[model samples]
Target: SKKISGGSVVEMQGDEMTRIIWELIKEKLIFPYVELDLHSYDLGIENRDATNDQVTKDAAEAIKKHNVGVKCATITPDEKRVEEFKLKQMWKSPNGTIRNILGGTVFREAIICKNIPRLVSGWVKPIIIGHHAYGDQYRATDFVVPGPGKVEITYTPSDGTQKVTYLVHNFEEGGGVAMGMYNQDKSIEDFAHSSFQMALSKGWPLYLSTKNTILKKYDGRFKDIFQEIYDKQYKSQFEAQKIWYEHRLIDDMVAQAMKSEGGFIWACKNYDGDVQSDSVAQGYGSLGMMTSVLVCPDGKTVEAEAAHGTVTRHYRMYQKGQETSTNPIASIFAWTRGLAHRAKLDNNKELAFFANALEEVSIETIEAGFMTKDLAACIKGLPNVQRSDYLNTFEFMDKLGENLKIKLAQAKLSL
Candidate 1:
């Protein structure tokens, strides 16, 4: 049989409930319909420990070679995970490890539905938050400012060829807070290019947020770099598409974000990305309905996954032989999303239609009033939720699969 899609997809299995959902996705949702060339890696805790975590490196390389990946949520070990999983040093997040290897920015987007009760009711469309996952708060050098004197930051090149220094604060004025932060020119350039490319791809306006008004030289550098890149590389395309790229102060962006209907891309600095993505997730109702994609600077390679975690609490219920109602919407979308991008890359309409049909079915089903416990709770108060309002984990997947089959058939016939 001829393959339905051209590019190969590498699947990295992970811990707990997501692992179980992973199998359901492949068995019911993926393998039955499409003849995918799946390169599988067991990123399950035991396997990751056994392989000394080289498996994650191998999976990332495979994704780079193939240009797309679909991943399951894995546990980034804390002390509890360390004790539970047993043996070997606590490994870093597989996503972080892979992202470092690929040098990409992770963009988190909510899967929006008309009926999913969001706390912020104005978000009728999806807002994609592209987080700069490097430097700034994640890499800041900090110390307490003691009585008087001055605090300064200096960078000494590894070669010892040159030194650059800056004053962070002069404590003679009586210090409240003091810290130094920086981003390399290279990282900012790549961040700008990626944001522009992503915006162009989605045909959405791009907004970069910063506190450039206050931190003139600091945040101003970000605004300057994005503008330079936009003018030089993206302005023509943006204009042709009738989409705009502009900067906003962080404060104004927050208020604007709440009041606006989404459908635009907000490119965020590292710290802002971290904080804002959570707000977006909460506004979208549940993390279970959020999808994440890592788009590299080249714009050719991407990794798609759920933005949420492994649902360890639900996994405990499954272990106890009790029914669990964990939502699998985002995990399922990971497959459809990567395949859709693959279709775009390969110019395969059938595959693209299949992805679109499946994604629409997932959202439409929720809009049609069938959902999981979390979403039901979002609609009805915790005290008001009843069993009839939602389906169990497997039940929801079965519902999605059935709906997908009907929609895919309709879409295929129409095409």
Candidate 2:
């Protein structure tokens, strides 16, 4: 079953129960098949505290150099986590740190199983949500206007040769909140390309949602640049594939999305993406099945990870010497997707097969009724799931390992 040859990856190790699953997934599913030079960086909260957050930056830079990363779910500590981990500071999110250093847009995709029904029975296909994780609220400058006061936006060229001042609000009535947000030409262009390229790769139509009807110049720029780039660069390619790209106003887009049978990429501004991706996760049935990939403008690099947070609750159970049945597919996918990237870059067909086979086995295992509690819950309601309904975390990986060997053995003979 060990089929992987020479390859490498930047391993950004994460925190919590997922960290435990990360190692198991590699041991049972990855390391045995692939010979990798894992440039490991401990991104666990404790390690982050130990390194004064240098490790997180180092991991991102390493990804830029290596061109691929398979990360674990990391902790962004709060009061309890700070005390629990003995952390010095409540560090920023590692995902944010990584994305900032490594330029890209995050795409959240759900891994669907045929048997696990989506509540939206109308959704006949998978829905992939492409998040534009830049501005329009994520990094807005906000303030509470204490009384009647004027708020203005002043834009000056970096060279200071040009200035445009526009009044944002004049709170003449009473106190209110004032805020502003923006996206750069460069970032927006990258986002457009990344979204289009993602759709192009998937042969899926792309929709960019923005309140351009209202924001006019603000959201309008997004619509304009995407259309311009599509017409100039990607239109013919999209035509060849019988797919297309369009800009839809946010409200109309959401309504259409709710009714559509899913097989498209909905690109959203930061705020919408943040809110909608969760809805996508819930609709897909479980957070554990959602996979995240950071696709860059260059399309040469990607960082794969689970879209869910560290299972702190289950981790505490594990620490208490109790077994838990946390889903590991998304975490395993972080490796497979990264290895798939590695296979593509190295032109290693066998490694690609191993990656593909592993993914196939993981899915097949679930469909065959060997899955963790999370996925089982999708089929059996949480309270209704019995002991025989699902396997615990360790047993689940063991089952996948067994099935992977069988699958890889079959694949070894070109099955």
Candidate 3:
């Protein structure tokens, strides 16, 4: 008995419906073909709360050491969820916690199949969005000004050399909301490197969007740093690959993205990435088909996961012992993508071939009309979709498993 062996990857098990799918994916698809070394961590909401959220940090540390992580979608608790789950304290996003430890940019791309009709019909290729997952609005501090006063941002040197202060706003009339946000140049440079590395890896052009004309110094710094880094390091590499990097105005880039067929990477700021990733995911048909990868600045450490959440709706039905046709393609890709990265890092040809075969079979299975309900809705409209149009979650996993086995057999015959 022979199985492809590869370097270890951190296995981050998440919550809800994805957790169920995760097990089936491993049992049906992964275990049969390859023997993978996994450092398993239970990042489920209960486990996270139980461990006082130290498990998430431990998982991140394992990723740093192993350089690859495959994660299932997890729950990020809010006020309503806090009551439902009855947490010790409101747990912060495991994703944010991981990114804080890892220091990377998250690149989200949709998996496109010819049979799956996109809302943006012209987009036949995938659009990868590299989101700077650091500071900016996500870390901003805001307050409501009661009376007229000056809102200012000040910076004091660590050496106690000189302090500089700038007035953000002087309230002249009525009370208003004011906020302050910041990004370190070091983080921004890391973001640029990650974006460049991602584009280069894909051999595609890169576009960075910013409102430099309005936020003169703020956005201008972003533009300047990217340009400097590209010119200094990545420009020649990009040109050699017949790919290029350019900056675009946020408004202009949106219009361009709408009209242009996707095949390039778009580097986005924190807020823009948060908003646009969803919009793009919808345009591609469903979030269930989107795959997210966090690439560290070193371009070695990576964490792969589904772009969608825990699928609470499906999990509820599953809890009641009702059959649900939850799409598992994105979750499958989390494994494929992370393992593929491991294969690349270790230069294991067999592992790489197997990983590609897994992805190929998964996509071909869906294209062959063996998809879950979400994809069925994409093709046949939600109102018109029938039971025969799609397979239940377990069946879909089995189908891919059967097809992948056949695909590998075919490859052996060809060889």
Candidate 4:
């Protein structure tokens, strides 16, 4: 509350409907109270097209330099978006580009509100999912086996020490799915370190999920690497924190996730992460309330962003003088959460408290009945919803700004 005097800049980037909400967020919420040294970059589709996506790369570098970034959702161009934007060529997702540039795993965490309707009521707190963003589905080499002439998969180490090989079905095999996958000793080691550091930072227990029983050679590598790292690097720290780390079969992990009360970090291998993150997002109830953080392998640099996409549809409605009820809470958390990480890096408690307090205000305000139409729809059926149940986009953000100021002031007085 005692004004966190030194403000760290957060590089902001995004596209479409989220871009519209991003502006309102700064105007109604961030700027009114907090004076941010905002190093801003436009990642809107048009701008990205114009820059040929260089702006996104520059933003990621800037985040690495400054140690914090807060981003809005951007469009990952499909054929439709390409036509809508009249692009020179189809562009990859800005998020993907940035993540690649940052060289970090993206961890998506949900924002929890007491009154919000979560599909899994057992998740009373947040379940942060640290996803391995490399060398799984995102980077697998797939090919249709033609007549299956003894297909084999192999990995030749860069050191040229030896080559490891796996034989696919002999040509006597039936027609079915077959693909080769791998994880580098280096990448898995980094992933393990990041997950361990993240769990330690959050003071939460950590669990890594894998299908080691099936993919014994592949996933077993992941489990073994994580175990080795935990034993050598994280075990003492985890014990000191009174938290634990363990491995689980993917199926059992899913079942446990459903029944357990939240407040832990669940590290997932590539495929599981890609699938489970969506499940966790829906279970917690709103993408608009999900916050994403990218923790580098070194565990120092981070970039935070909204897990949802650019609300293109909503922005189009706003363009035509139509009222749009879009949720901006996740975007707001992108700021607070990123700032909190910055506070941690700088060892600035005041900044950390400011971030935590702002987040609390946002959640408390929503739980106290100030939310967007999207959230209200989640509460009651969409057709039966009443306007009085939630605030318009701008109005709800304003409420958060007002609440943040009051809370910050009280925190200052108490200090």
Best by lDDT: 3
Candidate 1 segments whose C-alpha is farther than 4 A from its true place: 1-3, 146-148, 155-177, 412-415
Model 1 TM-score on a 0 to 1 scale:
0.94
Candidate 2, residue 74: CA error in Å? 1.1
Question: Ranking under TM-score, best-scoring first?
Answer: 3, 1, 2, 4
Consecutive 10-residue window with the lowest summed lDDT within model 2:
1-10
What digit string (tens of lDDT, one per residue) describes model 4 on residues 1-415?
2234545665666666888888887776666556566778888778989989888888888887887888878878898878988998898877778777777788889988888888986778888999887887777778776564777877789986889997877776555566766668887888888899889888999999989899898889988999998999889999999999999998998899889999889999887888887778888887798888888877888888888888777888988978888888888888887888877877877777877887888889988888899789788858988988888877887787789878977876887
- Native-vs-model 3 lDDT? 0.92
Q: What is the C-alpha lDDT profile of model 2 across 67-164, one tens digit per residue?
A: 98999999987778788778888889899999988889999888888878787767767778888887777779998899998899997899859799
RMSD of each: 2.2, 2.0, 1.6, 2.4
Candidate 2: C-alpha RMSD to true structure equals 2.0
Q: Comparing candidate 1 with candidate 3, which one achieves the higher TM-score?
A: 3
Task: Please give me the total number of clashing residue pairs in predicted model 3.
Answer: 0
For 128-176, candidate 3 gives per-residue lDDT tens digits of: 9999877898899988999788999999999978999989899989889
User: lDDT of candidate 1 vs native?
Assistant: 0.87
TM-score, candidate number 2: 0.94
Per-residue lDDT of model 1, residues 1-415, tens digit only:
3336545788889889999998998887777668887888988888999999999999999999998899999989888889987949999989999998888888889988777788876778898999998899788877776678877788899987889987867777655667676788888888888898889888999999999878898889999999998998889999999999999998888898889988899999988999887778888898899999888888998899999999989999999999999989899899998998898888988788778877888889899998999999988977999999999999999998898778766756776
Each prediction's TM-score versus the true structure: 0.94, 0.94, 0.96, 0.92
Task: State residue 128's C-alpha deviation in candidate 2, in Å.
Answer: 1.4
Judged by lDDT against the true structure, how good is candidate 4?
0.82
Clashing pairs in 1: none
